[PDB]
Amino acid sequence: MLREFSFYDVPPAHVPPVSEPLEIACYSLSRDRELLLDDSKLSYYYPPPLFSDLNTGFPNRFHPPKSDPDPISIVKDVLMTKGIQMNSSFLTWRGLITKIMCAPLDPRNHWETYLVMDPTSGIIMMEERTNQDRMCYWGYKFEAISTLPEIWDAQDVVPDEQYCSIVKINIGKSKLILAGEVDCIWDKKPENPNLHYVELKTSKKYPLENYGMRKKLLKYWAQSFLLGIGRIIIGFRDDNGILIEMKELFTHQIPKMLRPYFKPNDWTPNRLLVVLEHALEWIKQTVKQHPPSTEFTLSYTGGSKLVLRQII
Ligand SMILES: Cc1cc2nc3c(=O)[nH]c(=O)nc-3n(C[C@H](O)[C@H](O)[C@H](O)COP(=O)(O)OP(=O)(O)OC[C@H]3O[C@@H](n4cnc5c(N)ncnc54)[C@H](O)[C@@H]3OP(=O)(O)O)c2cc1C
Ligand SMILES: [Mg+2]
Ligand SMILES: [Mg+2]
């Protein structure tokens, strides 16, 4: 027995309201994976030298990332440890909402998540249960050379070391608690901090007329939008992996920058939000229609549809 949700069955609607994502907790992960309830792993952004060689250190200074999905119970336990109550509809990693939201854009990227409603809180928890080639290293390396740790109050490329923000964000009728990795911060951490946060990306530069470039930027936007990240800073590199150009974007500016280039068919920020809000309402309706602790999988395998299965 399958339940299916059609991207294209969603009528043209007004873009749903989305609240300013509010940080309710944060934590750091040491290089050794120790989970610390502090900001010791929040780094500051500082522009690296132009023509930096992103190959430097690959592979002998590269500690490849863990490469196993993290259970979302980590985040539930963080909130429990700090005595924060979960009064929302969804609890998951930011990147798993990005996957739902951007699925219309990415027929090639197939994924599967696991959902269970928590019996005490009633929130729907979602996780994966199921990245270190030279291309990804350039990404990790750009993050490394573009950041500065806290020093006053306190090289190898260790993507396992991370800072994480946990936000409350409302998308239409769905209240979500989302945990996501924050690459660094623009200035002193305050007022809600997320607009101060920065996402770092590395990419070849293509014109905005290029459909692939637009799709990539839309995914950049979606990711940072879901965590309230104020800035996305792109290190443009050439085919040799040399840093050529720094581009500082404000997240809210990406939908504006792309407006003159969308073709009449294209997926737009507003269309993506409309569909996402319908998908979330559908997931919620389907799950709540059962007793808590019932396990489901949410799958996308190409085409136009999400499929929710009850696990037995
Ligand atoms: C089989 C499998 C292996 C995974 N291995 C890792 C891992 O080694 N480290 C990790 O942080 N998360 C890994 N994940 C994903 C985590 O379970 C979790 O969803 C995620 O870490 C939550 O953090 P978000 O900030 O919401 O992740 P996202 O919004 O999805 O991505 C943010 C950043 O997390 C990093 N990241 C995300 N996914 C992976 C991945 N699959 N492998 C390596 N780095 C990744 C990467 O630097 C990425 O930056 P960028 O987008 O610029 O490339 C894995 C998932 C699966 C299914
Ligand atoms: Mg990182
Ligand atoms: Mg990044």
Author numbering: 1 to 130, 138 to 161, 173 to 208, 231 to 352
Excerpt from the paper describing this PDB structure:
The DXO/Rai1 family of proteins consists of mammalian DXO and fungal Rai1 and Dxo1. DXO enzymes are capable of removing the entire cap structure by hydrolyzing the phosphodiester linkage between the first and second encoded nucleotides, releasing GpppN from unmethylated capped RNA (GpppN-RNA), and they can release the intact NAD+ from NAD+-capped RNA. The eukaryotic DXO/Rai1 decapping enzymes can eliminate diverse 5′ modifications from RNA, and here we show two additional activities for them: release of FAD and dpCoA caps from RNA (deFADding and deCoAping).
The overall structure of the wild-type SpRai1 is essentially the same as that of the triple mutant, with rms distance of 0.2 Å for their equivalent Cα atoms, and the binding mode of FADP is essentially the same as well, confirming that the mutations do not perturb the binding mode of FADP. Two magnesium ions were observed in the structure of the wild-type complex, one occupying metal binding site 1 and close to the 3′ phosphate of FADP. The catalytic role of this metal ion (if any) is not known. The bound conformation and position of FADP in SpRai1 are highly similar to those in mDXO, indicating that the two enzymes have a conserved mechanism of recognizing this cap and catalyzing the deFADding reaction. However, loop 65–71 of SpRai1, which contains residues that are not conserved in DXO, makes more intimate contacts to flavin.
